[PDB]
Design a protein around this ligand. Sequence first.
Ligand SMILES: Cc1cc2c3c(c1C)C(C)(C)CC=[N+]3c1c([nH]c(=O)[nH]c1=O)N2C[C@H](O)[C@H](O)[C@H](O)COP(=O)(O)O
Ligand SMILES: Cc1cc2c3c(c1C)C(C)(C)CC=[N+]3c1c([nH]c(=O)[nH]c1=O)N2C[C@H](O)[C@H](O)[C@H](O)COP(=O)(O)O
Ligand SMILES: [K+]
Ligand SMILES: [K+]
Ligand SMILES: [K+]
Ligand SMILES: [K+]
Ligand SMILES: [Mn+2]
Ligand SMILES: [Mn+2]
Lengths: 500, 500
Amino acid sequence: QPAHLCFRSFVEALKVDNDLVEINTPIDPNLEAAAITRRVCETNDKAPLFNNLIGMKNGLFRILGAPGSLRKSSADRYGRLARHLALPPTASMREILDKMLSASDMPPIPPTIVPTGPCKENSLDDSEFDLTELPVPLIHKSDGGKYIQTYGMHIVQSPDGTWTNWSIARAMVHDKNHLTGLVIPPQHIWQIHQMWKKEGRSDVPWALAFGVPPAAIMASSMPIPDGVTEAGYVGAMTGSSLELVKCDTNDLYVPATSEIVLEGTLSISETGPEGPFGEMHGYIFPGDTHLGAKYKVNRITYRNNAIMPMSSCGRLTDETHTMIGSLAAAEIRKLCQQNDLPITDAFAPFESQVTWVALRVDTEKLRAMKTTSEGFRKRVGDVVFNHKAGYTIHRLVLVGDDIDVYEGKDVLWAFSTRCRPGMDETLFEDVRGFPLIPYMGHGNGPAHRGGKVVSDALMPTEYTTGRNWEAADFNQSYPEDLKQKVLDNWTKMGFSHHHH
Amino acid sequence: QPAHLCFRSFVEALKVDNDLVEINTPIDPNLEAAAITRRVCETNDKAPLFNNLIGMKNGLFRILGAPGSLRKSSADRYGRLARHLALPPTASMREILDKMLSASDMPPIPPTIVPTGPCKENSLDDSEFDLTELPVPLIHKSDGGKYIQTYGMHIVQSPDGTWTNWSIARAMVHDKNHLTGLVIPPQHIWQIHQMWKKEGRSDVPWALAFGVPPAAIMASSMPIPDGVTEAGYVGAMTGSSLELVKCDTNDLYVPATSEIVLEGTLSISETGPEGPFGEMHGYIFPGDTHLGAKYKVNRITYRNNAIMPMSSCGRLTDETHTMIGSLAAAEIRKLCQQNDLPITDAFAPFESQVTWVALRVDTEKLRAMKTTSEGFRKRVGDVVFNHKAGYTIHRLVLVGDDIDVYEGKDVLWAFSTRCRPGMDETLFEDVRGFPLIPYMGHGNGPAHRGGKVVSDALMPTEYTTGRNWEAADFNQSYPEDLKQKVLDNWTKMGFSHHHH
Ligand SMILES: Cc1cc2c3c(c1C)C(C)(C)CC=[N+]3c1c([nH]c(=O)[nH]c1=O)N2C[C@H](O)[C@H](O)[C@H](O)COP(=O)(O)O
Ligand SMILES: Cc1cc2c3c(c1C)C(C)(C)CC=[N+]3c1c([nH]c(=O)[nH]c1=O)N2C[C@H](O)[C@H](O)[C@H](O)COP(=O)(O)O
Ligand SMILES: [K+]
Ligand SMILES: [K+]
Ligand SMILES: [K+]
Ligand SMILES: [K+]
Ligand SMILES: [Mn+2]
Ligand SMILES: [Mn+2]
């Protein structure tokens, strides 16, 4: 099966790429696996596959860390993401995000039901598993629980059957047969949950599939529109209907090649202690436990030699930066274009801990609008910050056509030199805020509201007559023939490879 | 003579360090020298010494580019700056800035007059030179003139004789015997100029010395206090009285080992076209010429085989970042401490194009103040932004004791995650602004006023009871013994030198 359609094939792809280290000696899921993974993520090393996890019983489970993290070289920096999508490993960010957006104007390709698959190789019923006995990792030393769920896909369906959502929300083990986790607005698992609670008749039928098709985990992490079933979007994106099998204890459908599947219910009434957890923005607040959603597990099914993917998230760079930030930015780029805003590209700079999105503007189009900074900043912020795709983003930086928004250094340069603090900015206090950012949920103001800003790094003449400067750089402040002479004589004179 | 006290010895030091490329074939001062230098600065290469400059006559002149730019390795990144100051080449930024501040609580060591020196090896009077005939560089393709002065020291003295200031302000050739340049408030050359214009009797006696003692060019680029003679400060800093010779046509004194010396006057009445110039913030605005100050040159003296230093300034990283930013930040650190503010360290991040300064706070001291963010932000901004040392800085970022302000990545992390836009910031509109930043002089508001902000990246509990988080990083979210186990087994398991 292809790597983008089968997690087990994706692991083999990473090996073939010389992008995997298989650790076959005993590794402790209490911190050690996540510590190795953390170091990998902070150094852009090869992904670790822990084949000998202390506490692994009857096939549950091996761990793959850092599945969507960065490689060291510039030439295949995003290779692990490209391997989720059948793209060449040298794919640019622009090409990855375009591939993630491509299904947005295609008909869905709904999934195909098959009668069985590898996820049915083993099962454990209600008397045979205990979630406290599995090798679930403690990921950070102060975490409030063992976070079994950092890279699986929650599957829930609207009561009317019309929308089936796939999404990554965190969850940790509560006891032998329950998990707790975050289920918060405006996320789709929350939106569906609310539908079931207003009906008031039963808990939400639920499954959580780990080690799903890599193309499906990518869509699970992208804020595609309300009401859209991720399976059909992935089908369109990949040009192939995904094969799903039915759960044994409910009528939801899971990828046939899922490594591990939990089946059960998400309660519409119960809660339990959840968190704290070491989070995307680089922090944990020890002892900051709050009630979260409560899931009951009725059944586990799994592949022989099952592998659990894990995100050891925190400071730069991991799946929470490469996937949450970049995929939000892709959806925001589309959203702006559909609102007739002249945006060509969008990216969430890593240097902003993916809290900013830089929006590249077609300034020829801007000029024809015959508008001003104040008006244009307000229009952009109202579109993005009132939409779910803007949830996690607190600062939008508008830049002209000379800036490559996928290059943090150039975004930082533009922001720092072209946006006058205050005067060139519009603050938004009456929009939903992202409470996980420290300055929101542990800050001086309301955890759930405001704290957002549009910073205009467009220069004045970019609204009127056109760019009126040249950069004081080697590229722009010397003629072509001189530049080429310099480069051709560089090593000859005494001064100092693309792949490496 | 030691390298920090003699420019010619400093060039030899850079060679011995394998930090120099001597180019002995013909190089054009029309762009080519500055293009090579620009590339050096954008790639942290070795400093270029152009020994065969097309148009060099009767010893005037060779060029050294990139004299205060960065080296490639992390271990001696600031080595070229250390070589200005007799510090080991591995010196940290903290050690360089401490050495620049050390004279601030020492008695001055005034200079020693000697009867001659190498700067008197050759002379040209009023009938023998023509500044349009020398190999003065065109540094950027759209510059409004040939900028002879990018790394020399202007010397002017108060009418009462009590203060002699040394400073770098840019100047370009106007005609055979004049230069034009920037003389703008609040700079000391401007402050002295104003004194002479209010007396109204004569133009300002003036000299411009190129290739001065490296310790003296550093102090020339630092905003030490009003009224303080840079020579005595350098004397104290170095522990040695500087040797100066008298000018031939005026009574000012120049370093004895200066490579080239211009003697003349700065007019109290005349102006001439000046600029545009490719500037520190990374831009040139072609055709943006304005009247600047006008200098008359009456005499040139120079060393045999004289060498002119040159800054090919613009985008990262050159002398305008490493010296203007860092030395302002050092003076701001001192200024805050003298105003009883609990600041331990200050640095202007390169990523902010040296427009921000990050101030590290002793949060134990902050806690004893029993204050709030709003009050503390106002107090810090009022101290810094009303002082000359704050002129070039438009954003101050306050951070707690965990952040290394000399590490841009950590400053960016703190800013982006701990400062809530708007609410955690105070804007300052009634302070002097730096017009050279594009968003000031080519922006939407007053070029000379406002546009400044204090951004508080201190978390709430840092004012009260103490830090209440741990970072979600390898350093902080795993115990010591585990971390060390991981590191000791890293290459054994399969994963990947300080000098490289
Ligand atoms: C890649 C990624 C995405 C996480 C995520 C992480 C990763 C690695 C974890 C598991 C490591 C940390 C926690 N995560 C949560 C999360 N969304 C959320 O609501 N709660 C979370 O707890 N997301 C973000 C979420 O998946 C996106 O917002 C999706 O758009 C949700 O899909 P939806 O649009 O269908 O609601
Ligand atoms: C390192 C450095 C400093 C420049 C400088 C450059 C460099 C490389 C140039 C020459 C390449 C670009 C232009 N420069 C100017 C300048 N100050 C100024 O007022 N006008 C300028 O034109 N300075 C900043 C100035 O030297 C500091 O502000 C000093 O504090 C001035 O000394 P003072 O405190 O005694 O007035
Ligand atoms: K999704
Ligand atoms: K602007
Ligand atoms: K000075
Ligand atoms: K704050
Ligand atoms: Mn969805
Ligand atoms: Mn001075």
